[PDB]
Design a binder for this molecule. Structure first.
Ligand SMILES: O=C(NC1(c2cnccn2)CC1)c1cnc(OCC(F)(F)c2cccc(Cl)c2)cn1
Ligand SMILES: N[C@@H](CCC(=O)O)C(=O)O
Lengths: 273, 275
């Protein structure tokens, strides 16, 4: 029985309160099919854990993996709300820390594959290929990652990413982006949803984040726009400990799902509409 | 020991073969076994020179993971196909332990992963469709592909057989595949010529190569559909023997190149196009 850790991140993982009787409301996808939901425990400062409802692209993927590899699971939301970075001694936070400490056995989330994490855990082959882009409020004019308001920044134009995410580390690690990283360090947000809302409320001027998320937000909210294309390619993989007996069949199943159209179906169901 | 047998295959711009007696500039020595005649098994190793995007990746891995190598061009098939339950091509060379790794435009898929290990992907690929600009086709799911004899005249479309693209089509769309075989193309250059002269309506093939050719097409007449859409997203990988002790170091090195910005240089050098 596998302990799955995930994180709130639409459209990959929706998190909704349970009904008064502890069950999850019956809903239907854009195609008319029922939405498969799982009970996931997590916090709402103390972390009071309560049962909640989880669904979306990553939950559909988990259900597929569980059905095809014959394992049972319990899902919970990462206690500290973070994706996972390594901060004398060094420590992993977020889902990475939970997987390494045994609080989880598998990470099923939009978890970016990078060298830092791969040193410590095993990634599947990517279940989603995407990249980094920039989200702004409609009317804001920036060309992209090379815009002067990003490369020669001031307090007149504020931009940020999510703390303790792969994107934060992307900017920390490259000296060519040090001017940006030092600006963003003062303004990074605790979660992507808070950053998106801050862009909507004109309190954050540009949000640098995963294109699969940003492009979905822009497709739903017409006052939000992305700056165009990707300045960096990245991908999400399933995360497991290096000694996991499940790792090779997980990766084979991901490849089979790309190849037989299952991932494309998820993409149409959850991502593009 | 630390000196590895490595197999590759020519497919521009990822692996480009030139003549030489010392390879110079951005080239590395690679040998090709050339037969003396067809009534004999006797052959001779011709010394040639290899360059391209995947050769620059091998150079980086060689420097970073700290190994040396003798690079050679596969002569038993191409990328890889299982024939009567025996793998040929670059996959075969790895499966049968004649190479320690395979480096080139080698697509990661499930059936190959059952017999070799792959590194992390480092070039995005999959299946794209190349057409003349304006051709009304949605994708692989288009009825013109799926039910070709529903149209008079039927749509003319083909692939280059025996690689990952034909395998996928044969598995997913049996009627399309059996229709397609009469339009099999001997190679990419023939297929582009068929497209430009109106003997083929669509060319279904590896997404990264089609993206490259679309970017350098004269007059930018030939395009990939859906603004470069890719069915069955995957990547090129380095193939290694199952249980290889080199896999972890190769993976970490590739991810280091990505994270430190080194891959952008290779992409700009080899993969840019005017279109
Ligand atoms: O950007 C990369 N490669 C280049 C490329 C790729 N495609 C076309 C043109 N250029 C610049 C050369 C790249 C990025 N991340 C890598 O590892 C992470 C990953 F495995 F999750 C993954 C995510 C997304 C795409 C890929 Cl292929 C792999 C490896 N390579
Ligand atoms: N990259 C493909 C070859 C071309 C194709 O079939 O699309 C392979 O590894 O088999």
């Amino acid at each position: 029985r596998l302990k799955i850790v995930t994180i709130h991140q639409e459209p990959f993982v929706y998190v909704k309160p349970t009904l008064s009787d502890g069950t999850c409301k019956e809903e239907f996808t854009v195609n008319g099919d029922p939405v498969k939901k799982v009970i996931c425990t997590g916090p709402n400062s103390p972390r009071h854990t309560v049962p909640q409802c989880c669904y979306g692209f990553c939950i559909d993927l988990l259900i597929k993996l569980a059905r095809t590899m014959n394992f049972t699971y319990e899902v919970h939301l990462v206690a500290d709300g973070k994706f996972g970075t390594q901060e004398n001694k060094k420590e992993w936070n977020g889902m990475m820390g939970e997987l390494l400490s045994g609080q989880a056995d598998m990470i099923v989330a939009p978890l970016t594959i990078n060298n830092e994490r791969a040193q410590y855990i095993e990634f599947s082959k990517p279940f989603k290929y995407q990249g980094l882009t920039i989200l702004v409020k409609k009317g804001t004019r920036i060309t992209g990652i090379n815009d002067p308001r990003l490369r020669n920044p001031s307090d007149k134009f504020i931009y940020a990413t999510v703390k303790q995410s792969s994107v934060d580390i992307y900017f920390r690690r490259q000296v060519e982006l040090s001017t940006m990283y030092r600006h963003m360090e003062k303004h990074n947000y605790e979660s992507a949803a808070e950053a998106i809302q801050a862009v909507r409320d004109n309190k954050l001027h540009a949000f640098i984040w995963d294109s699969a998320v940003l492009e979905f937000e822009a497709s739903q909210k017409c006052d939000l726009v992305t700056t165009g294309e990707l300045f960096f390619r990245s991908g999400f993989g399933i995360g497991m400990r290096k000694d996991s007996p499940w790792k090779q069949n997980v990766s084979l199943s991901i490849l089979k799902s790309h190849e037989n159209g299952f991932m494309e179906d998820l993409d149409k169901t959850w991502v593009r509409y | 020991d630390n000196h590895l047998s490595i197999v590759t295959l020519e497919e521009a711009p990822f692996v480009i073969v030139e003549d030489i007696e010392t390879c110079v500039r951005n080239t590395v020595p690679c040998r090709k076994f050339v037969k003396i005649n067809n009534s004999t098994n006797e052959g001779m190793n011709v010394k040639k020179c290899c360059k391209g995007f995947c050769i620059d990746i091998l150079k980086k891995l060689s420097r970073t993971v700290k190994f040396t190598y003798d690079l050679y061009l596969v002569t038993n098939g191409k990328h890889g196909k299982k024939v009567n339950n025996v793998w040929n091509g670059m996959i075969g060379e790895v499966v049968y332990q004649r190479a320690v790794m395979a480096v080139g435009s080698l697509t990661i898929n499930e059936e190959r992963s059952e017999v070799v290990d792959f590194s992390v992907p480092f070039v995005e690929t999959g299946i794209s469709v190349m057409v003349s600009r304006g051709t009304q086709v949605t994708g692989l799911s288009d009825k013109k592909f799926q039910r070709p004899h529903d149209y008079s005249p039927p749509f003319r479309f083909g692939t280059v057989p025996n690689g990952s693209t034909e395998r996928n089509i044969r598995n997913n769309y049996p009627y399309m595949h059996q229709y397609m075989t009469k339009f099999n193309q001997k190679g990419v250059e023939d297929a582009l010529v068929s497209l430009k002269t109106g003997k083929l309506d669509a060319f279904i093939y590896d997404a990264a190569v089609l993206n490259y050719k679309a970017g350098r097409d004269e007059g930018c007449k030939l395009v990939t559909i859906g603004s470069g859409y890719i069915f069955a997203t995957t990547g090129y990988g380095i193939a290694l023997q199952k249980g290889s002790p080199w896999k972890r170091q190769i993976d970490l090195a590739l991810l280091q190149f990505v994270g430190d910005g080194e891959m952008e240089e290779l992409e700009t050098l080899w993969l840019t196009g005017i279109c």
